[PDB]
Amino acid sequence: YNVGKAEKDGEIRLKNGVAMSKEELTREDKNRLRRALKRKRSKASTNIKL
């Protein structure tokens, strides 16, 4: 068993086993997780005048 992508769309799950639902996350955390997602992927006549 390898902890992988969350089965539920609203849920976010990480390799360390930490799971967060999108509802509970604050906005600053959502942006932080989104940025972390980016880096991981990158490694891998009338009208006119008037």
Binding site: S45, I48, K49
Partner: protein, 841 residues
């Protein structure tokens, strides 16, 4: 080159913000883009104008458009005005000194609401960024931030130090505890956005997008985990549009309460709160009526609950205005009459007085007592012109013409006209001529203050452009009817002379200063040049992607500029029609370009709200003028060239005048601080029978433990070796202290084990040599409780693995098929068994 600066700005009465009334009908405070205007309602004249400084166009001036005022709030007792701007800046203004006192910057978006506390020492600010920040005036700092809402704060209510209620555009009503900085309750005010919030005693009213208006009782002290806000009932206002603002005013003599619901349309709806005796009288009466109808008591009770709202509120009167309403505020409350003041979107102030007696008002409609309308134009100015003397400025707008004294900035005369498009002064500065969109030509005399002649059929369509010859005896008018008509001035009336019919719609006509060239723009993206005396075709300038909107010819009739909707300014030589240069000047459509007289330098204005100064010879941008908030529609240059006048969509006429420790080293410091405290408290305890820690708000054991966690594991073993032995005894006292606190011990049990065992192993020889009896007891205590914690974790792991194995085993007996033959069983187990794939070399 010389610098252009904003010499004056006028023509704005009420911009996009709220209105603040101050008693002496009294004066009114209203926003004018970046400045604030104080008006005397009785006289209608501007009492004073608040300008921070830094006039646009100066070298020290910023390179972006000024932030407009969004919300005004004044504390009457202290005579302080708080002004919120679109960029998220709060400035505290001294009314008497007319100067800025404080400057708060804590918001990333426009400020939506400002409210002084009762004592006037703290200011609460809500902004479009969804944050509420409470500021300290005497402290000049932001105390704390409330960050639960997920959209613009539409309104909030805080009359008490202890609680705050806030409303936001996400449709949520939230109760805050100012002493804890947290949200206690959350309810959905409306299905969509929630825009209004007014609270009187327990009564609370909020407005959504639709006509539904909710009533909530505010039981602050309920403290049940809920119910502080509970829904009472719903009443429908007549206006189907959203409700923006709600405000309460109480009559001291009669204790009567009234409130309005400022809609997005031209309607303000006023409501009266029924007294308790009126409610009880009404409740009994309707019970008699409904009982007479034969309904059951349970139905009567439910109907009373359904009709709950009707008992408290009474539709009092509706105020209807000609223009859309922007903001409103109660002015005075009395038994005789009720008065309101409002600001429209069309840049005017209206004062409404309501005489009333008992339940209902005396008159069917409110009495409009005062209006401030002279110093502004309702519609955007489409064209401007300056008299030859450079004293009188004519501004033509849809439905009205107003003329201003450039020195006093005051309107002199106002003329009612059609949808005016173009305006120019005739020679002598005594007459004005207009081309309306209805094809009409209107001529005005300033002395008579009356319209002399109207030519109804001057053109079959809009007269987009109009120009005069230098002699002033001839007029050239271009229209959308695809014709140019020449008119003569004979003693004063206009006689049509000649018609020149073109293939497409006409957008601009310009006559050269020497009257030799007539340049005309067409909707097919071409500019044709003709010879005025003979009307012989000369040139067809080509290369604009979108239709040319303005044309202007140099003073020497040599160079001609064309500005088009494709954001390009193209400069041409009239000798041959060759294009000298095409400038990508503005970010939006360029509406007008004018030459500076006796020079080739020219100005340009566009829809991006920027007026740019160019060099007609070097073809470079000299100066960028950021003062307007929206599209700049018209531009005019003085005959002397001293100043330039620009009018924008913001109803503003602006006159521009020419003027470290490493891992291990940190840990040793942590041990010194923590164990000095532990030793001190112990010694203090024995007898009876610091700044760093208090600042961080942690116990000595926690402080040392946190420092251990920050050390990376790759550095930890090297960090521990660097410590002298004297600190190892200190470390061994720290771990002993941790053992009593069982919560910390199990929280970081593996970490504590790894560090302890490494310390003992590394300097085991010195540790055993020491003959300290106290040390021997510490290790004994550290050992025993360390074992129990480790055994406690181990027993749970052992218990579960045996239990979970049993759970797996029992399911197999019930739901696992069994082959008696071993060979058949082996084939099944291979198939059922999990399989994994690996790369192999």
């Amino acid at each position: 080159y010389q610098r252009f600066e904003q010499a004056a700005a006028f023509g704005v009465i009420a911009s996009n913000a709220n209105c603040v009334w101050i008693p002496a009908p009294g004066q009114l405070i209203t926003s004018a883009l970046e400045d604030v205007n104080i008006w005397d309602i009785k006289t209608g004249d501007l009492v004073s104008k608040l300008s921070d400084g830094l006039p646009p166009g100066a070298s020290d001036a910023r390179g972006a458009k000024p932030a407009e005022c969004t919300y005004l709030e004044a504390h009457k007792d202290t005579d302080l005005l708080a002004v919120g701007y679109a960029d998220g800046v709060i400035k505290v203004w001294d009314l008497m000194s007319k100067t800025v006192l404080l400057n708060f910057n804590g918001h990333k978006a426009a400020i939506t609401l400002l409210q002084f506390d009762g004592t006037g020492t703290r200011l609460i600010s809500g902004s479009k960024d969804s944050n509420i920040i409470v500021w300290d005036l005497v402290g000049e700092v932001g105390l704390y931030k409330l960050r639960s809402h997920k959209d613009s704060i539409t309104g909030f209510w805080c009359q008490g130090e202890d609680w705050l209620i806030s409303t936001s555009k996400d449709g949520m009503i939230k109760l805050w505890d100012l002493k804890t900085h947290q949200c206690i309750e959350t309810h959905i005010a409306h299905t969509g956005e929630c825009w209004g919030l007014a609270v009187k005693d327990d009564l609370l009213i909020t407005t959504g997008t639709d006509s539904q208006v909710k009533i909530w009782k505010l039981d602050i002290e309920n403290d049940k985990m809920g119910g502080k806000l509970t829904e009472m009932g719903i009443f429908e206002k007549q206006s189907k549009q959203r409700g923006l603002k709600i405000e309460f005013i109480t009559n001291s003599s009669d204790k009567t309460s009234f409130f309005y619901i400022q809609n997005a349309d031209k309607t303000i709806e006023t409501f009266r709160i029924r007294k308790e005796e009126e409610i009880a009288r009404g409740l009994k009466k309707r019970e008699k009526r409904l009982k007479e109808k034969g309904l059951t008591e349970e139905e009567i009770a439910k109907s009373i609950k359904e009709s709950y709202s009707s008992f408290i509120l009474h539709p009092f009167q509706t105020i209807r205005s000609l223009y859309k309403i922007k903001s409103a505020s109660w002015t005075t409350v009395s038994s005789s009459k009720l008065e309101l003041v409002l600001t429209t979107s069309s840049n005017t102030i209206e004062y409404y007085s309501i005489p009333y007696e008992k339940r209902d008002p005396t008159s069917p409609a409110p009495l409009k007592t005062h209006t401030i309308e002279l110093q502004g134009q309702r519609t955007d100015v489409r064209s401007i012109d300056i008299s030859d003397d450079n004293k009188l400025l004519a501004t033509a707008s849809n439905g009205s013409l107003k003329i201003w004294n450039i020195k006093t900035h005051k309107c002199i005369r106002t003329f009612e006209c059609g949808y005016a498009l173009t305006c120019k002064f005739l020679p002598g500065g005594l007459l004005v001529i207009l081309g309306t969109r209805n094809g009409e030509l209107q001529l005005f005399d300033l002395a008579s203050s009356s319209l002399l002649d109207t030519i109804e059929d001057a053109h079959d369509a809009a007269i987009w452009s109009l120009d005069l010859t230098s002699d002033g005896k001839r007029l050239v008018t271009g229209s959308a009817d695809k014709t140019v008509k020449f008119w003569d001035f004979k003693v004063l009336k206009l006689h049509h002379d000649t018609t020149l019919e073109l293939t497409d719609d006409i957008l601009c006509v310009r006559v050269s200063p020497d009257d030799r060239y007539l340049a005309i723009s067409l909707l097919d993206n071409t500019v044709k040049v003709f010879f005025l005396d003979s009307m012989k075709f000369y040139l067809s300038l080509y290369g604009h992607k979108l239709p040319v909107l303005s044309i202007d010819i140099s003073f020497d009739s040599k160079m001609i500029i064309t500005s088009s909707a494709d954001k390009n300014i193209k400069i041409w030589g009239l000798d041959f029609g060759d294009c000298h240069k095409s400038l990508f000047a503005h970010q939006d459509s360029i509406m007008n370009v004018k030459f500076l007289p006796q020079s080739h330098n020219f100005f340009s204005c566009s829809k991006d709200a920027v007026v740019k100064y160019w060099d007609g010879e070097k073809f470079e941008c000299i100066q960028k003028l950021y003062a307007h908030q929206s599209e700049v529609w018209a531009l005019a240059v003085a005959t002397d060239g001293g100043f330039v006048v620009s009018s924008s969509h913001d109803h503003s006429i602006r006159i521009w005048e020419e003027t470290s420790l490493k891992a291990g080293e940190r840990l040793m410091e942590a041990l010194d601080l923590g164990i000095a405290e532990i030793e001190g408290l112990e010694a203090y305890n024995r007898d009876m029978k610091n700044a760093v820690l208090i600042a961080v708000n942690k116990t000595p054991e926690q402080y040392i433990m946190d420092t251990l966690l920050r050390i990376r594991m790759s550095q930890l073993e090297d960090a521990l070796m660097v410590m002298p032995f004297s600190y190892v005894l200190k470390f061994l006292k720290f771990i002993d202290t941790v053992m009593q606190n069982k919560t910390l011990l199990h929280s970081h049990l593996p970490l504590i084990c790894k560090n302890l065992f490494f310390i003992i192993k590394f300097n085991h020889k010195e540790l055993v040599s020491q003959k300290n009896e106290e040390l021997k007891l510490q290790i004994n205590r550290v050992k025993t409780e360390l074992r129990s914690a480790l055994k406690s974790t181990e027993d749970d792991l052992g218990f579960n693995v045996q239990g979970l194995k049993f759970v797996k085993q029992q399911w197999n007996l019930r739901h696992n098929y069994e082959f008696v033959d071993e060979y058949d069983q082996q084939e099944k187990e291979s198939n059922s068994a999990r399989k994994r794939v690996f790369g192999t070399v």
